[PDB]
């Protein structure tokens, strides 16, 4: 009364866990990890479904495997025990239109080839001063400038195909920033089997009594006497030499608004600095969501573990491109109810990569918010997705899906993410709207509220921004710093 | 004479064309060969079919100023000058067969990782880099991926015209600015530019053997036949490899120019840090197309061993890796790049690309058709097999439904003294920006350089030469107007 801790970490996602791991590795005693949920892991969450099949409903992949320090760490472990922690599941993308059917690897459409050109065209637009536009506006520039060297079908389907990027950002192409759109993936992705393995291993690397679940932090206060007071929901009070705040950027955002009775919101005294407050105007939050379709057994072609359905497109669009006089003129005549074919869906066929009869599919805002809201009405979900499911089975030498919630594929269960509605995540991760500069947030975050009040988390770091390993590295960064500072006695 | 231009390749021609367009009169283009075009040459074969035996593609078509200029004419008259023949590559191994877009091998995907890896690494050969990659990422590669990936990525040999052991890893990968456009044909482009300036400017079969800055501030050029010439400005566009003869004493070397004063050291030194690739071509003309037109792009992989995979897995490190490895030539000894012209052009021929050291060996026997056929017969049969046809029959002399080879054409760029190779390329330890900067600033105010080797954007490429020519002329033209 009040209990004195060396370091207090808020949030037990991967950033928080790694911070705690690092502090203990560094010999620091008497620390505490305060987590509002009843589980560790945060936006790493593995869930179980039909037949006890397991699925990562948060992050699934180790990305940038050539440099990903967290991935490398897993890999070194597997190299030593022979255990399977991940599988490389990069594959040839199957691309489907409702009408045309398969559209990938087409010797007429050559979509993947013009995609690479489209992308290289993008890279040549973004070398200082040049303003931001939506990724949509970017694709339209390309199509206009290159219409002479594109078939009508290329003009039609290419724009739909390049929108798989929506499922990497969790954002619609009209909402997505062209600048931050095309990013260099540093090597193949590795599918985690599963991520809870990663969370558990790190969780178990520090004192088990450091961990306090079901503990929502409500306020943090810098004492003029060079200490930090942390107040919890249940009236528990703590005093720390250092605090590392890892709550999602969206939750951290609640702080700069007046009304305090919001789940997750931390009251700051003195308030969060102007640089931190203003940085919120220049970075945003994506709604990447997941829907898991579990089937009795695989009754489809295992040609590929990567399937993308394209939203519908018109031949009328192609003529508008042919007939526009220039950009401004094209933007006008375009503006002159939502279904499954209204946007690109990314489907991961787990039967091929993991041997489980289930499709893990990804969706983006605004669809995600909508779909996560009705995540209780399973039959409405079935009807919504049924046309793209039947389409998929058809293009994979199978028949319509039968609602089982022979050789006909029978759906046994549907699982949906909840990241938008969960007060402790409030969306998927850091995303850029047109005009955004994520560098502002990273600089303000990595610089800290002050010497004692720090931040970590996916939204606080350049390399691996938005990714598990970025989060993981941010936590190590704050902790090694604090560890060094403390070691000076 | 206002300007004297050496070389009537695309650099020289555009330089001459640009001079006329800007109102400059009384110039002169000296060319050692009996034709214009330089390394742009279109030849005729069986049935009259035409082929670009030098350059055939407009590269970097998102930027490429010459390409845009061509497309602008085809938008004006609707006349086909090119075709986008970019396609999905079929990859063929002698033993396994087709190997592209395979669901278990995923070679193209690991190739993309390999390139990403090369990008991150930045002083060695492309071969060492690939080995370095496999050794580092072997935990994440299947056995067959280790076997076949290093063969697949050697497609890059047919870009630099250089074997992977001879090729610098630094200058190996590069980004194309978009799709390629197969030109139909380059001669159309050659003739268009050649005619855009007065034909009395042209002098053929005039080999230039000395260039001389008068201390009187003028340029004295003299030809092989003893003809003397006088000009204010001189634009030299001879290929790098020929220009490189100038740093040697011996005079009677075909093509070699005597400089007075000698080339500036920074030009002489720059030859240490860049060299020359040897891309060659072979054309295989068939009576009719009796094969699949699935792709216009086909690559055959040099042979690989499972013995090789075993070695990677067992190598404790890089030193040990070189040890195990070292520890005659055929058509399977190296990758080869075949273009199926039937799909893109309508012509029943394969245009095949080859690299040093194979190139000079095949060119040196270009006259011996039987030996050529026998040398290529195995890959050709393989190709037809993977393309739903039968073995090729030799119909090159006078005689069912099998493919009949009627003629074979081979390039000769390595034995031709006025090309002496294909285009500039990097050996390990080279740096092309030495040469490009030196050429850009010239020998003095009066002695200029143009050519594919004289410019950063489009180095080695036709549009590079074309823009280099535009630059020296557009500079010279500006100076003359000022009086
Ligand atoms: C759907 C989805 C898919 C993704 N896919 C990938 C992927 O494939 N690969 C990849 O690398 N990354 C992926 N990510 C991103 C990755 O999940 C995140 O970058 C990372 O998990 C975030 O870690 P963090 O510790 O920064 O945040 P979190 O783990 O979200 O935050 C840590 C903790 O803060 C807690 N908290 C919030 N408020 C309070 C409070 N008031 N008091 C106490 N605790 C609080 C939260 O409960 C949370 O547990 C994905 C994310 C989502 C949402
Ligand atoms: C097989 C092959 C394939 C190629 N493929 C492509 C391709 O697909 N796309 C592409 O862009 N590029 C390609 N290239 C390269 C391209 O051909 C060159 O970049 C370009 O043609 C060179 O232009 P240039 O005018 O600088 O040189 P050149 O045109 O070679 O030289 C100009 C003239 O200099 C003359 N000359 C030399 N010495 C003397 C002398 N002593 N006196 C008078 N004249 C002299 C030569 O006769 C020549 O006519 C290819 C080259 C080869 C060999």
Whether the Cβ atoms of residue A177 and residue A71 lie closer than 8 Å to each other: no
Burial readout B352-377 (b: 16 or more C-beta within 10 A, e: otherwise): bbbbbbbbeebbeebeebeebbebbe
Q: How close is the nearest chain A Cα to the Cα of B228, in Å?
A: 48
Whether the Cβ atoms of residue A181 and residue A166 lie closer than 8 Å to each other: no
Domains of chain A: 1-87+190-283+424-489 (3.50.50.60), 88-189+284-423 (3.90.660.10)
Chain A contact set for B87 (CB, 8 A): 107, 110, 113
Residue A87 in contact with partner chain B when CB distance is under 8 A: no
Q: Tell me how far apart the alpha carbons of residues B330 and A134 are, in angstroms, rounded to a whole number.
A: 53
- The size of the A-B interface in CB pairs under 8 A is 71
Residue B422, Cβ density class (10 Å: 0-12 exposed, 13-18 middle, ≥19 buried): buried
Q: Tell me how far apart the alpha carbons of residues A424 and A266 are, in angstroms, rounded to a whole number.
A: 11
Chain B contact set for A124 (CB, 8 A): 62-63, 177
Tell if the CB–CB gap between B117 and A66 is shorter than 8 Å: yes
Sequence-separated (6 or more) residues with CB below 8 Å from residue A304: A91, A92, A93, A94, A349, A352, B103
Structure tokens at B100: 């592209």
Q: How close is the nearest chain B Cα to the Cα of A353, in Å?
A: 11
Query: Which residues, judged by CB distance below 6 Å to any ligand atom, belong to the binding site of ligand 2?
Result: B 6-12, 30-33, 38-40, 54-57, 59, 207-208, 237-239, 242, 255, 257, 279, 281, 411, 413, 418-419, 422-423, 451-452, 460-462, 465
Sequence-separated (6 or more) residues with CB below 8 Å from residue B179: A113, A114, A117, A149, B61, B84, B86
Residue A402 in contact with partner chain B when CB distance is under 8 A: no
Q: Provide the strand spans (E) within B171-270.
A: 181-183, 202-203, 208-214, 218-223, 228-231, 233-236, 258-260
Chain B contact set for A123 (CB, 8 A): 175
Q: How close is the nearest chain A Cα to the Cα of B177, in Å?
A: 6
Tell if the CB–CB gap between B116 and A91 is shorter than 8 Å: no
Q: How close is the nearest chain A Cα to the Cα of B139, in Å?
A: 8
Residue B109 in contact with partner chain A when CB distance is under 8 A: yes
> What is the CA(B39)–ligand 2 centre distance, in A?
3
Q: Based on C-alpha coordinates, what's the Rg of chain A?
A: 24
Tell if the CB–CB gap between B179 and A79 is shorter than 8 Å: no
Of A401, A285, A249, whose CA–CA distance to A340 is shortest?
A401
Chain A contact set for B86 (CB, 8 A): 110, 113
Q: Please report which helix (H) or strand (E) contains residue A221, including its range.
A: strand A217-223
A348 lines ligand 1 (CB under 6 A): no
Among A92, A120, A188, beta carbon nearest to B178: A120
For CA atoms B468, B190, B61, B48, the dihedral sign is negative
Resolution in angstroms comes to 2.4
Give the helix ranges, DSSP H, for B138-296: 143-152, 157-160, 186-194, 240-243, 265-269
Q: How far is CA B140 from CA A78, A372, B113, B135, B306, in A?
A: 11, 36, 11, 10, 17
Q: Tell me how far apart the alpha carbons of residues B108 and B152 are, in angstroms, rounded to a whole number.
A: 8
Give the helix ranges, DSSP H, for A41-110: 69-81
Ligand with the closest atom to the CA of A194: 1
Classify B43 as helix, strand or coil: strand
Q: What is the C-alpha end-to-end distance of chain B, expressed in Å?
A: 16
Q: Tell me how far apart the alpha carbons of residues A69 and A73 are, in angstroms, rounded to a whole number.
A: 6
Q: How close is the nearest chain A Cα to the Cα of B178, in Å?
A: 4
Strand-pair category, A211-212 with A31-34: parallel
Q: Is B282 left (phi over 0), alpha (psi -120 to 50) or beta?
A: beta
- Give one DSSP letter per residue of B376-417, joined into a string: HHHHHHHHHHHTT--PPEE-SS----S-EEEEEEE--TTT-T
> What is the CA(A158)–ligand 2 centre distance, in A?
37
For tokens 């809201």, name the residue.
Answer: A373
Residue A463 in contact with partner chain B when CB distance is under 8 A: no
Q: Tell me how far apart the alpha carbons of residues A85 and A75 are, in angstroms, rounded to a whole number.
A: 8
Residue A84 in contact with partner chain B when CB distance is under 8 A: no
> What is the CA(A89)–ligand 2 centre distance, in A?
46
Structure tokens at A267: 């009251």
Strand-pair category, B181-183 with B218-223: unpaired
Tell if the CB–CB gap between A124 and B61 is shorter than 8 Å: no
Backbone angles phi, psi at B151, to 5 degrees: -75, -35
Whether the Cβ atoms of residue B185 and residue B42 lie closer than 8 Å to each other: yes
> What is the CA(A474)–ligand 1 centre distance, in A?
12
Task: Output the residue whose Cα is nearest ligand 2's atom 19.
Answer: B461
Of B483, B468, B457, B2, whose CA–CA distance to B239 is shortest?
B468
Residue A73 in contact with partner chain B when CB distance is under 8 A: no
Read off the DSSP letter of residue B45. Answer: -
Chain A contact set for B62 (CB, 8 A): 117, 120-121, 124
Q: Tell me how far apart the alpha carbons of residues A369 and B215 are, in angstroms, rounded to a whole number.
A: 80
Among A67, A75, A185, beta carbon nearest to B139: A75
Chain A contact set for B175 (CB, 8 A): 120, 123
Tell if the CB–CB gap between A304 and B139 is shorter than 8 Å: no
> What is the CA(A159)–ligand 2 centre distance, in A?
39
A291 lines ligand 1 (CB under 6 A): no
Of A305, A273, A369, A276, whose CA–CA distance to A91 is shortest?
A305
Q: How far is CA A132 from CA B179, B236, B335, in A?
A: 26, 45, 44
Looking from the CA of residue A470, the nearest atom of ligand 1 is 19
Of B185, B241, B206, whose CA–CA distance to B416 is shortest?
B241
Looking from the CA of residue A39, the nearest atom of ligand 1 is 49
Classify B325 as helix, strand or coil: helix
Tell if the CB–CB gap between B120 and A79 is shorter than 8 Å: no
Tell if the CB–CB gap between B86 and A304 is shorter than 8 Å: no
A58 lines ligand 1 (CB under 6 A): yes
If contacts are CB pairs under 8 Å, which of residues 17-46 in chain A contact chain B? Answer: none
Q: Tell me how far apart the alpha carbons of residues B284 and B409 are, in angstroms, rounded to a whole number.
A: 7
Q: Tell me how far apart the alpha carbons of residues A92 and A111 are, in angstroms, rounded to a whole number.
A: 13
Whether the Cβ atoms of residue A2 and residue A239 lie closer than 8 Å to each other: yes
Q: How close is the nearest chain B Cα to the Cα of A91, in Å?
A: 7
Among A67, A90, A149, beta carbon nearest to B84: A149
Chain A contact set for B113 (CB, 8 A): 66, 187-188
Of B57, B110, B102, B126, whose CA–CA distance to B297 is shortest?
B57
Ligand with the closest atom to the CA of B182: 2
Of B238, B274, B419, which is best to mutate to test ligand 2, by the most ligand atoms within 8 angstroms of its C-beta?
B238
Sequence-separated (6 or more) residues with CB below 8 Å from residue A108: A151, A153
Question: Any long-range contacts for B215-219 (C-beta under 8 Å, 24+ apart)?
Answer: B217/B446, B218/B446, B219/B4, B219/B446, B219/B447
Can you count the helices (H) and strands (E) in chain A? 17, 23
């Amino acid at each position: 009364s009040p209990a004195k801790k060396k370091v207090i970490i808020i949030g037990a996602g991967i950033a928080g866990l790694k911070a705690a791991s690092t502090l203990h590795q560094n010999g620091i005693q008497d620390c505490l990890v305060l987590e509002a949920r009843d589980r560790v892991g945060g936006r790493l969450q593995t869930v179980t479904g039909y037949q006890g099949r397991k699925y990562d409903i948060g992050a699934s992949w180790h990305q940038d495997t050539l440099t990903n320090p967290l991935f490398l760490e897993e890999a070194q472990l597997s190299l030593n025990d022979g255990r399977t922690r991940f599988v490389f599941d990069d594959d040839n993308f199957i691309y489907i239109d409702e009408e045309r059917g398969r559209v990938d690897h087409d010797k007429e459409l050559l979509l993947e080839i013009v995609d690479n050109e489209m992308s290289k065209f993008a890279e040549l637009e973004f070398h200082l001063g040049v303003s931001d536009c939506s990724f949509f506006q970017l694709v339209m520039k390309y199509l206009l400038q290159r219409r002479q060297f594109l078939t009508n079908d290329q003009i039609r389907y290419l724009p739909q195909l390049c929108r798989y990027l929506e499922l990497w950002h969790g954002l619609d192409w009209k909402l997505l920033s062209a600048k931050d759109t095309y990013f260099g993936h540093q090597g193949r992705n590795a599918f985690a089997l599963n991520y809870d393995s990663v969370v558990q291993r790190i969780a178990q690397s520090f004192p088990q009594n450091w961990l306090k679940l079901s503990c929502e932090v409500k306020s943090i206060t810098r004492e003029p006497s060079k200490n930090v007071t942390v107040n919890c929901e249940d009236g528990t009070v703590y005093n720390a030499d250092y605090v590392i705040i890892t709550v999602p950027q969206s939750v951290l955002n609640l702080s700069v608004q007046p009304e305090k009775n919001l789940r997750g919101r931390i009251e700051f005294q003195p308030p969060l600095k102007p640089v931190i407050q203003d940085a919120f105007d220049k970075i945003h939050f994506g709604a990447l969501g997941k829907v898991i379709f579990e089937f009795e057994e695989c009754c489809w072609s295992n040609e590929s573990s990567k399937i993308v359905t394209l939203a519908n497109s018109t031949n009328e669009f192609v003529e508008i491109v042919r007939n526009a006089e220039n950009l401004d003129e094209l933007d006008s005549m375009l503006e002159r109810s939502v279904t499954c074919w209204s946007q690109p869906l990314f489907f991961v066929n787990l039967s091929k990569s993991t041997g489980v009869a289930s499709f893990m599919m990804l969706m983006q805002a605004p669809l995600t918010n909508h779909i996560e809201s009705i995540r209780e009405d399973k039959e409405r979900l079935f009807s919504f997705f049924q046309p793209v499911l039947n389409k998929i089975m058809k293009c994979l030498d199978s028949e319509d899906v039968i609602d089982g919630m022979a050789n006909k594929p029978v759906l046994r269960n549907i699982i949906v993410s909840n990241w938008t509605r969960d007060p402790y995540s409030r969306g998927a991760y850091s995303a850029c709207f047109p005009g955004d500069d994520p560098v502002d947030m990273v600089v303000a975050m990595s610089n800290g509220q002050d010497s004692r009040i720090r931040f970590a988390g996916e939204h606080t770091i350049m390399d691996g921004a938005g990714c598990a390993y970025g989060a993981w590295e941010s936590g190590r960064r704050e902790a090694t710093r604090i560890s060094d500072l403390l070691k000076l006695e």
